[PDB]
């Protein structure tokens, strides 16, 4: 429960 | 609380079919997105399928591409995984996991795991086990069952219907020179209590549809 | 994909004392304001339980002893004070991108006092001999540490290729392990000999513990 | 005899005191086992001490003795030691070390000291 990453997908 | 309860799993032929089943209850389904995890006899875990919240977005390990399908039924709560053309290296202990999903903006962490599915991909047939006693001074005797030559994994015990916990060891199996397992499970209990107490295990092979309660008696002699 | 590199392997820790286990990262798994990695523990016959998401956030329930630190590539798991139910493997994982990937386990024995194991010996059922063979089997009970020898001697003979042992994970309770031996061999070959020797040595016993029966005695 | 053990540093101390026992071997050289500590106090059995592994494999007690004794050694001098504090009567014994000839820890003590005496006894 947090933000994705900039690295994840859409 | 949150419940997931995974089933389907067993003995499968190589190039063969399974479908596992995962019952989610305590939790807003819809809600999460939703794993299986695999664990391997060398104990690594490995990522098999998630799929996000709503189903529209699912991520498939590369070796696994092709064969399996991960699946959801918001009617069900029920998480699926289907299985196909099954190989040796599909041998594990399949988690259904709450999480695990990056998708959508959001990332939900792996945070329950069910008990987990055994998968024995193999050509072999099933065999049930034998169950045998194992029959006892110092105030402290040790009794048992030996449960001997079945196939697949795995084997459950119990004593005296899950009435005695304390003090009981069920080993890990042992893969015999045959290719068939074998374990033992022993219990401590007090010199004194053997003709006085009752002791029973109960032996569990799913794969075989065995189900025994052996009595252990120490030798009238 | 990203590799997850866990040290060590495995780690034993005096009870009450500190354990720490690291997780490096092939590439940065951080932003100035969020690190994606997480922290499970697999205690025996279980499955993975999470400890620690987002580095160092207690999953909600977890005891406090538990803690995660780090940022970039370099993450540590602390267990201060370990206690005998820690006995488990921990693994971490991130959830950078996809591929979520596992790091390979690190082994937490807990560390107690020396016991040595109690033996017992079992010879096989009537009803096993009937079927053409004997299990023979010797315990050691509830013993630490790990380390021990069994040896079969069947009338002063030391047997070699016809054993076979299983060792329990550590227990949550006592930090102990037990140990089975099981001698094999066919009906023939066991009415052959008469006297059945388990002979034992642990670190924790001045001299070797020998049980054993006679063939057909009560 | 592949090992000949020897302990001293045995002898009468107030309760509360401390008393520090050496091992010394002859024959092999002792880097490559543990080295292990046991005593015997008036008709009982020999009860195990401690246990000083290869050095970075770690040293093990009995609960009699957990946080008051230490195991130590110096491979150079092919000794051993046992620092015992906070001395209790309990602890009055022969004390004697062993080697353990297993480099796998099985505990296989072939070869045993001849015991130095520890009196643990209040007196002037």
């Not at chain 1, 429960?1 to 859409?10: D, G, L, N, R």
């Not at chain 3, 107690?112 to 079927?131: G, H, M, N, Y």
């Not at chain 3, 054993?163 to 009415?191: C, G, H, I, P, R």
């Not at chain 4, 309990?90 to 505990?107: K, L, M, N, P, R």
Request: charged share 15%; hydrophobic share 30%.
């Amino acid at each position: 429960q947090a933000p994705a990453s900039p690295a994840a997908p859409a | 609380e949150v419940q997931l309860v995974e089933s389907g799993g067993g003995l499968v032929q190589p190039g063969g079919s399974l479908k596992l089943s995962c019952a989610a209850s305590g939790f807003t389904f819809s809600s999460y997105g939703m794993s299986w995890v695999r664990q391997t006899p060398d104990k690594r875990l490995e990522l098999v399928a998630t799929i996000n919240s709503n189903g529209g977005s699912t991520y498939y390990l590369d070796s696994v591409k092709g064969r399996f399908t991960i699946s959801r039924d918001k009617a069900k709560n029920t998480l699926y995984l289907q299985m196909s053309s099954l190989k040796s290296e599909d041998t594990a202990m399949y988690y259904c996991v709450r999480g695990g999903s990056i998708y959508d903006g959001y990332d939900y962490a792996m945070d329950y795991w069910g008990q987990g599915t055994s998968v024995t991909v193999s050509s072999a047939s099933t065999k049930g086990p034998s169950v045998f006693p194992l029959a006892p001074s110092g105030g402290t005797a040790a009794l048992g069952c030996l449960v001997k030559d079945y196939f697949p994994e795995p084997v459950t015990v119990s004593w005296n219907s899950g009435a005695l916990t304390s003090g009981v060891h069920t080993f890990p199996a042992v893969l015999q020179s045959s290719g068939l397992y074998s374990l033992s499970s022993v219990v401590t209990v007090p010199s004194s209590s053997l003709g006085t107490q009752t002791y029973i295990c109960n032996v569990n092979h799913k794969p075989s549809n065995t189900k025994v309660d052996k009595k252990v008696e120490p030798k009238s002699c | 994909d990203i590799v997850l590199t866990q040290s060590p392997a495995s780690l034993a820790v005096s009870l009450g004392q500190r354990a720490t286990i690291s997780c490096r990262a092939s590439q940065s798994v951080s932003t100035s304001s969020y690190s994606y990695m997480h922290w499970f523990q697999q205690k025996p016959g279980q499955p993975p339980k999470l400890l620690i998401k987002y580095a160092s956030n207690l999953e909600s329930g977890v005891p406090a002893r538990f803690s995660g630190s780090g940022s970039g590539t370099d993450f540590t798991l602390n267990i201060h004070p370990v206690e005998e139910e820690d006995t488990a493997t921990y693994y971490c994982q991130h959830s950078w991108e996809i591929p979520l990937t596992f790091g390979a386990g690190t082994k937490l024995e807990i560390k107690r006092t020396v016991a040595a194991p109690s033996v017992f010996i079992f010879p096989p059922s009537d009803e096993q001999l009937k079927s053409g063979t004997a299990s023979v089997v010797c315990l050691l009970n509830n013993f630490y540490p790990r380390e021990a020898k069994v040896q079969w001697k069947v009338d002063n003979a030391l047997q070699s290729g016809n054993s076979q042992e299983s060792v329990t994970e550590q227990d949550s309770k006592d930090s102990t392990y037990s140990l089975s031996s099981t001698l094999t061999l066919s009906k023939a070959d066991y009415e052959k000999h008469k006297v059945y020797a388990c002979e034992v040595t642990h670190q924790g016993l001045s001299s070797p513990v020998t049980k054993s029966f006679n063939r057909g005695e009560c | 005899m592949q090992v000949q053990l020897q302990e001293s540093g045995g002898g009468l101390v107030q309760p509360g005191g401390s008393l520090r026992l050496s091992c010394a071997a002859s024959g092999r050289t002792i880097s490559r086992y543990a080295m292990s500590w046991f005593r015997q106090a008036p008709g009982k059995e020999r009860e195990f001490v401690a246990v000083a592994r290869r050095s970075g494999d770690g040293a093990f007690y009995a609960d009699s003795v957990q946080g008051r004794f230490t195991v130590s050694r110096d491979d150079a001098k092919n000794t051993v030691y046992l620092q015992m504090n906070s001395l209790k009567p309990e602890d009055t014994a022969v004390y004697y070390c062993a080697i353990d000839s297993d480099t796998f820890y099985s505990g296989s003590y072939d070869y045993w000291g001849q015991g130095t005496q520890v009196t643990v006894s209040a007196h002037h």
